[PDB]
Design a protein around this ligand. Structure first.
Ligand SMILES: *[C@@H](C)[C@H]1/C(=C/c2[nH]c(/C=C3N=C(/C=C4\NC(=O)C(CC)=C4C)C(C)=C\3CCC(=O)O)c(CCC(=O)O)c2C)NC(=O)[C@@H]1C
Ligand SMILES: *[C@@H](C)[C@H]1/C(=C/c2[nH]c(/C=C3N=C(/C=C4\NC(=O)C(CC)=C4C)C(C)=C\3CCC(=O)O)c(CCC(=O)O)c2C)NC(=O)[C@@H]1C
Ligand SMILES: *[C@H](C)[C@H]1/C(=C/c2[nH]c(/C=C3N=C(/C=C4\NC(=O)C(CC)=C4C)C(C)=C\3CCC(=O)O)c(CCC(=O)O)c2C)NC(=O)[C@@H]1C
Ligand SMILES: *[C@H](C)[C@H]1/C(=C/c2[nH]c(/C=C3N=C(/C=C4\NC(=O)C(CC)=C4C)C(C)=C\3CCC(=O)O)c(CCC(=O)O)c2C)NC(=O)[C@@H]1C
Ligand SMILES: *[C@H](C)[C@H]1/C(=C/c2[nH]c(/C=C3N=C(/C=C4\NC(=O)C(CC)=C4C)C(C)=C\3CCC(=O)O)c(CCC(=O)O)c2C)NC(=O)[C@@H]1C
Ligand SMILES: *[C@H](C)[C@H]1/C(=C/c2[nH]c(/C=C3N=C(/C=C4\NC(=O)C(CC)=C4C)C(C)=C\3CCC(=O)O)c(CCC(=O)O)c2C)NC(=O)[C@@H]1C
Ligand SMILES: *[C@H](C)[C@H]1/C(=C/c2[nH]c(/C=C3N=C(/C=C4\NC(=O)C(CC)=C4C)C(C)=C\3CCC(=O)O)c(CCC(=O)O)c2C)NC(=O)[C@@H]1C
Ligand SMILES: *[C@H](C)[C@H]1/C(=C/c2[nH]c(/C=C3N=C(/C=C4\NC(=O)C(CC)=C4C)C(C)=C\3CCC(=O)O)c(CCC(=O)O)c2C)NC(=O)[C@@H]1C
Ligand SMILES: *[C@H](C)[C@H]1/C(=C/c2[nH]c(/C=C3N=C(/C=C4\NC(=O)C(CC)=C4C)C(C)=C\3CCC(=O)O)c(CCC(=O)O)c2C)NC(=O)[C@@H]1C
Ligand SMILES: CC1=C(/C=C/C(C)=C/C=C/C(C)=C/C=C/C=C(C)/C=C/C=C(C)/C=C/C2=C(C)C(=O)CCC2(C)C)C(C)(C)CCC1=O
Lengths: 57, 20, 161, 160, 169, 67, 161, 160, 161, 161, 160, 161
């Protein structure tokens, strides 16, 4: 059975509809795949010795 | 632009009038 | 042809979206300049033959073109040159009133360079003649509307080249 | 626009615009703030008009959405609501332009041939614009309604 | 700039919508108290990814101005008032915009730009939004913040915030 | 493909050139095999002297597989 | 234009000899097909409005071409493409009953490329539309007569591409 | 395609196709059914490959989805998955064509200038295609994926 | 230039869609007739000079065109006409191999008519010459291959006309 | 090309007059603005890629232009538009340093409309991108020098539209 | 050096040194002590400029030092500050010479191919020298800072 | 250049005799080993950028060669060494596919010793870099294929030795 009253309420503008190469299509994906951001390693360059900690081979 | 004044135009010498 | 109103409608129509505030500001700018455009058109219409008169005298007269051997020697050629500058001035006012250079790229320039090449009409000279119109029109009407007229007269010069 | 109409007519006769045409543009330019206000009201409730007028259309004309109908289905009902969104957009362009030229050139010339090919009843789309006329008049003052309805009834009149 | 999240429900566009519901003083306090919570619960800034060369001229313009007109410049940004600074601000990408606000906060912490009035408390409705922002992931937090900040500044066509905030006398 | 490493000295006869021409006078350049006949003729017709010719790439008597 | 019969006679007249054997074989194949070629044409003529309906639905409808920005968006442009596919159906019918694509040469492909490139009509979208006609006509009339229409409809398709 | 590349090479020497180039086309034509199977399987699980390989990318290179990273944010992660879907679509065009010309013309020529202006690391996009290869190879059979991975390896090689 | 494979790809790329069921069917149709196209090309490759030879022999030889005063009298002109026929046959073969007449537009029929009119070359005589190719080609290449070759050679005729 | 110095010299040379008080004052005005022009050019030179980056982001990126169907879709066409705006900014800097828009007409705007029409490049989308450059350059450089750059960027826009 | 550049320019036209070019060297020679003074200040405080701008870089771009990045690790952070030590050394050669050639020759030509091979973001190295400019402007007079900036911006422009 | 097949053909062509059984055995040897030759080449071409990167790291990086005083210090000299080893890997792949080391003599080893001696490029450092490439490749392709690849990498080492 098809009811028209439901789809009248479900009216979406055509310009608001997502195209093929629109990044809003993969916005729903990017929510499911939740990327883990790195905790910042607090580095102080003042403490770093240039001559020593540079690799030597 | 780039077009000079003496390409395809008559050039009149702009001189100050004799009463001035 | 397209005027400034139709141009912003067509730009919204091609995208298939309603006229937003940014597109509405384009209209409001035209409705602000509309009084300046109508008044300018009335001045040029009155001195239509008069603007050409000064422009030919400033640029074209007492030159190579009018002298025997030139492209304005015969009376038929001279009258056609007046007719051509009468064309250029009339269509520049149309584009000014419209607020878009759509009529110029439709009825003035689209197949003019080919005719001017074939007839042997010097484009370098006629551009200077339109530049002579531009100086007369700006002096008669004003600096505000003469700049507006200037753009569309420059548009013809660009299309001819 | 009346600007385009006056220029092309002057272009036809190869003459400068008469001051009787220039004053018409002058009156058009000055009285533009009213037209933009009506258009802003129409675009403001763009979804509200389509939904209400669409609901009233399928109530009055049930055979449109009944089995054997043209707009019978899922996407078919959505396309008709989109078609209403097109004509409402065409109306707003007409109100802005202060002329029925933009409505004609985009979506009024060859409407009879278009809906014949699709198999859509021409008088039912004319009814659909008539329903849009009544809703738009409801969310506007009497002076603004009568101005906009004039563009609406032109769309109805050209169809049926 | 980058595509803004308008209405898609979920949780991220819902937080953006709740920000937009709040008025100018509720929004301007919310981003400041968000900046205070940056580093511990919220995201650390990275003004290297954003082209901060464009905002550099505007930041020197702020830093030169006196304490009263500095906050008035910030007042115009939140209220979306017609000012040359707002027109310059709106002509940036969301990355520059959000980077500009971080640099303002850094100068207020250091004491070059005039800070928040002493002993200000965040609104109860604003506190609920900040708690929601705190709850979101690092990728979600920036998305909320970028969308919250992009709407600020004078844009041709868009005009709002009727309640407004007329700074502190 | 097979190529020649050739040294040639071409003097100026027509005009005295005020710019540095030593790079285009005495030079050692590599030329393609198919182009060498045209190149050698060009040096000869201009009024130059070929110093040394050597096959830099390839080997003499290549029937198949020279390209 | 020329049909198949006149093309056979012209080739016989150029050589300056009677219709001996090979000329007769092409004629008798034409006259035998003629009765069914008339029948196919009459069905196509009657269902001309309905054939286009299905063809546009398969290829053009619910696409970017019909969507704003496309070349089949505006109603005037829609009705023009309807008329165009009506032309393609009619001239394929003409070429079927002529047995030669010379009518397609002088009346269709005289400047079909000249009009379509100037306006900005997508070639690929038009090809797909005529390919949709070809499939509809093959399903409506028959597989045998659909292939007979197919060679002329592909001639327009190759004539565009 | 490979037909296009052969003809252009033949026209360059102003000659008809060599039997080596003719053998190239005919064997591709006969072995085209296998190529269409690869494209069908890649299309069939296009939302599966990009999602898995994206997850592999943000685990191997998490600095991309860290503050300072180009694909940091819900909008920016979405654009990255959009980019990954483009290259997967490019691969399907390449396998079908039997040549790497369609991948080159659309999504390889001027890619270095593009990602430079956007501020995207080119080595990270090469990693995303490398992880895209691994997920795709897991779905397809041994011999089928081996000749399919070669088109991925070009996209890696041209970017990295 | 684009071939039949590239035409499908470019149509899918412009829409930004993956190769759908209709696209896969279009490719399979080309892969069905691919061995035929390769075998057809090898025949033309061998009889490259032979097809051109007989085409002139059946139409152009001992005519007013090759006679003094004609446009194919002088040996330099005769060789230039042979050169043209060598171009037409080769590019038709390319188009036959490609399964698309896009190469013929890009390489041949981009400004061929303007060239021929400037040279004063009879297009009527060339159309007869390429029609003479069509029969000689189909004699060596076959029926289905001859039908394919017949289309692209008629497209050269259509572009010149 | 001609700079502000050469333009004054040429105008005096055409008349056949020595550099008068009006001519000297035009030079003095340029030498006063000379320090502003050099410093502005160094800022644009340092942030050459940065201006183009934030110009495409504002106007072009995340639109129908970037998405399939649009002109700036492929990486080839994207890098082409980046290069175009890199060329537009560089030539605006040249004209800013010179104090004349003679270089823009000679090297950029000479048949740029005919080029962009033939390719199918949107004029309105390109103008908006140059308009985006103007706002980015003005925010980076300054008020007076940003206005100076804005004149020549409008001159590119006027010659393109 | 500016004297060498003036020779190269004169030799390209195959002419003697211009009176304007000779005065340009003369102005450089006379103001040689002031320009050499800049190098002394950058040499004396070669440590604290690299340490501060390095720390400024890791706060401006934390992604590069974050896991998955290029500068992540004790050893990788060390070589980054070592690189900044090299770039400052290039500036000191540049401000002494009076030309941008010595900066270009040693560590700027073929730098894009180098950092791509090592997997270093070129935009991040552009930001490192940008911060080195900011510390240099703070530890020097306004006239000296404006002189040094012309050489610093050259490193910025060539990098990105 | 000469491969394995061409070398067999050329050796048969100098004597003027047909392909004998003794010469056929070397063909069978190549056709059997060719399965290993193609497979390894596809792996090397895949990881071409990463093979060089890994090899330079373990051999050249953080040594006296890349240190100021060495030949691989300057960014120009670094990019040149990267370029060289990119060629060394590419041409060794070509030789591995060919089945002959004549290509290495034909293109690479032509005027390479004299150039390296003139510029003062360390011979020991270059060998160790290619030896590093050898070990990376062999760990990637396999024991049998890596040895087969290692022959040409030792041949280019001995030629530079
Ligand atoms: C309610 C309105 C009625 C109705 C509508 C209906 N229309 C279609 C199909 C189309 N309608 C149009 C018309 C326009 N599109 C435009 O761009 C413009 C100008 C602005 C107009 C007026 C077109 C072109 C289509 C094609 C859709 C497409 O994008 O491809 C349908 C679907 C027909 C079908 O069977 O496919 C329907 C249902 N239906 C009714 O019965 C109502 C009276
Ligand atoms: C579907 C077919 C596609 C399409 C068509 C389309 N055509 C036009 C306009 C014209 N079509 C023709 C062609 C012919 N007229 C003839 O007399 C003949 C020979 C019998 C043919 C084939 C011409 C001359 C015109 C212009 C004149 C007119 O308006 O009728 C348009 C309109 C273009 C415009 O903007 O003016 C369209 C849209 N386009 C598509 O989108 C389909 C893929
Ligand atoms: C004298 C009888 C009357 C008169 C003459 C007058 N004429 C001009 C201007 C021009 N006259 C012409 C006309 C022609 N030149 C031609 O080549 C031909 C065709 C054979 C004709 C008829 C032109 C072209 C000019 C312009 C000068 C030029 O060569 O460029 C003037 C000067 C007008 C002015 O002020 O500019 C005059 C005075 N006027 C009278 O009062 C007499 C009755
Ligand atoms: C004069 C001191 C003695 C002399 C001159 C002489 N020179 C040539 C020919 C050439 N001279 C040069 C040298 C140079 N050209 C350069 O580009 C440079 C570097 C900037 C130099 C120093 C060269 C290369 C030529 C070749 C011609 C050319 O144009 O390049 C000749 C021979 C002239 C001829 O062509 O017959 C002569 C005679 N000989 C004397 O008797 C003086 C002692
Ligand atoms: C994910 C693998 C990595 C990443 C992606 C990323 N890309 C952008 C921006 C764009 N990407 C493209 C590229 C293409 N569009 C095409 O048509 C093609 C050819 C088929 C490609 C490859 C473009 C044009 C954009 C602009 C957006 C648009 O389409 O409108 C971003 C956004 C960055 C920004 O805001 O400037 C991102 C994040 N970034 C990474 O770090 C991942 C490793
Ligand atoms: C006789 C010496 C040898 C010979 C002759 C031969 N020629 C043809 C065909 C043609 N001959 C020409 C050549 C010319 N036409 C010109 O305009 C000029 C320059 C003034 C010449 C010399 C041409 C164009 C033709 C084509 C025929 C035509 O023009 O009508 C043939 C016929 C071969 C055929 O049928 O293909 C012959 C036999 N053949 C020999 O073996 C003699 C050594
Ligand atoms: C032979 C069937 C008939 C014929 C041919 C003919 N053509 C010319 C002149 C030219 N043909 C071309 C055209 C082309 N340009 C292209 O790009 C291609 C390849 C796609 C072609 C085919 C050109 C450039 C020329 C001019 C060459 C020139 O300068 O000589 C001639 C020469 C006429 C003359 O010399 O004036 C001829 C003979 N004309 C006939 O009589 C035959 C029926
Ligand atoms: C810090 C600003 C960034 C960074 C640094 C980084 N560099 C390397 C590797 C090398 N650096 C160089 C470059 C130079 N040597 C020179 O002679 C010059 C010009 C004077 C420079 C700048 C070289 C040669 C190397 C190779 C190793 C070595 O020093 O022997 C690395 C290591 C790369 C790796 O992962 O192996 C790093 C981390 N990286 C960043 O993220 C910062 C933006
Ligand atoms: C890296 C392994 C070591 C190294 C290399 C190095 N090479 C150059 C310069 C050149 N090398 C070549 C050789 C080739 N030409 C080719 O076509 C091929 C492939 C067939 C090769 C291998 C040439 C001709 C050049 C270009 C000359 C130029 O530099 O302009 C350099 C630069 C030399 C310089 O000092 O200017 C270097 C450093 N040297 C090392 O330090 C590594 C151990
Ligand atoms: C990581 C990363 C980034 C993102 C970085 C991020 C997350 C940046 C975000 C930075 C934030 C959260 C900035 C907000 C600062 C708020 C200020 C200066 C407001 C002060 C208000 C005042 C003074 C008002 C006071 C007031 C007055 C007086 C009143 O009138 C009454 C009350 C009230 C309190 C309102 C980048 C975008 C940089 C790049 C890429 C990237 O990945």
């Amino acid at each position: 059975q098809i009811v028209w009253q439901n789809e009248v309420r479900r009216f979406i503008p055509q310009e608001k509809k997502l195209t093929a190469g629109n990044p809003m299509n993969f916005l729903g994906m990017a929510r499911s795949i939740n990327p883990a951001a790195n905790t910042i390693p607090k580095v102080s360059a003042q403490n770093i010795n240039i001559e020593a900690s540079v690799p030597r081979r | 632009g780039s077009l000079r004044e003496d390409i395809g135009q008559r050039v009149d010498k702009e001189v100050t009038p004799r009463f001035v | 042809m397209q005027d400034a109103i139709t141009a912003v409608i067509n730009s919204a129509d091609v995208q298939g979206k309603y006229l937003d505030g940014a597109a509405m500001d384009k209209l409001k700018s035209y409705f602000a300049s509309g009084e300046l455009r109508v008044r300018a058109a009335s001045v040029i219409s009155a001195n239509a033959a008069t603007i050409v008169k000064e422009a030919v005298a400033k640029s074209l007269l007492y030159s190579d073109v009018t002298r025997p051997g030139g492209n304005m020697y015969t009376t038929r050629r001279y009258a056609a040159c007046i007719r051509d500058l009468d064309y250029y001035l009339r269509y520049a006012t149309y584009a000014m009133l419209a607020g878009d250079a759509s009529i110029l790229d439709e009825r003035v320039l689209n197949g003019l360079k080919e005719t001017y090449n074939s007839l042997g009409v010097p484009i370098s000279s006629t551009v200077q003649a339109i530049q002579a119109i531009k100086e007369v029109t700006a002096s008669l009407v004003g600096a505000d509307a003469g700049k507006e007229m200037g753009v569309y007269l420059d548009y013809i010069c660009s299309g001819l080249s | 626009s009346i600007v385009t109409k006056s220029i092309v007519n002057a272009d036809a006769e190869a003459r400068y615009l008469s001051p009787g045409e220039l004053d018409r543009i002058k009156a058009f330019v000055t009285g533009g703030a009213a037209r933009l206000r009506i258009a802003e009201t129409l675009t403001g409730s763009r979804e509200t008009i389509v939904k209400q007028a669409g609901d009233r259309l399928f109530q009055k004309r049930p055979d449109i959405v009944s089995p054997g109908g043209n707009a019978y289905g899922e996407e078919m009902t959505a396309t008709c609501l989109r078609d209403m969104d097109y004509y409402l957009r065409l109306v707003t362009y007409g109100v802005v332009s202060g002329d029925v030229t933009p409505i004609e050139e985009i979506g009024l010339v060859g409407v009879r041939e278009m809906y014949r090919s699709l198999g859509t009843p021409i008088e039912a789309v004319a009814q659909s614009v008539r329903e849009m006329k009544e809703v738009a008049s409801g969310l506007m003052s009497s002076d603004d309604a009568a101005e906009a309805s004039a563009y609406f009834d032109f769309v109805i009149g050209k169809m049926s | 700039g980058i595509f803004p999240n308008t209405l898609a429900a979920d949780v991220v566009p819902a937080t953006i919508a709740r920000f937009s519901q709040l008025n100018a003083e509720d929004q301007l306090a919310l981003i400041w108290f968000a900046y205070l919570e940056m580093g511990k619960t919220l995201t650390i800034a990275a003004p290297g990814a954003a082209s901060m060369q464009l905002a550099e001229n505007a930041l020197k313009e702020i830093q030169a101005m006196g304490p009263l007109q500095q906050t008035q410049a910030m007042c115009d940004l939140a209220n979306r008032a017609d000012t040359p600074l707002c027109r310059t601000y709106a002509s940036w990408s969301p990355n520059i915009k959000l980077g500009f606000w971080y640099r303002l906060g850094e100068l207020m912490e250091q004491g070059f730009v005039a800070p928040i009035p002493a002993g200000y408390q965040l609104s109860a409705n604003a506190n609920a939004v900040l708690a929601t922002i705190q709850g979101l992931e690092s990728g979600q937090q920036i998305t909320v913040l970028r969308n919250a900040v992009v709407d600020m500044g004078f844009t041709a066509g868009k005009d709002g915030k009727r309640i407004a905030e007329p700074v502190v006398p | 493909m097979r190529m020649f490493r050739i040294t040639a000295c071409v003097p100026s006869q027509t005009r005295i050139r005020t710019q540095r021409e030593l790079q285009n006078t005495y030079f050692t350049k590599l030329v393609p095999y198919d182009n060498w006949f045209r190149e050698q003729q060009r040096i000869m017709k201009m009024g130059g002297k070929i110093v040394k010719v050597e096959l830099a790439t390839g080997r003499p008597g290549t029937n198949a597989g020279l390209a």
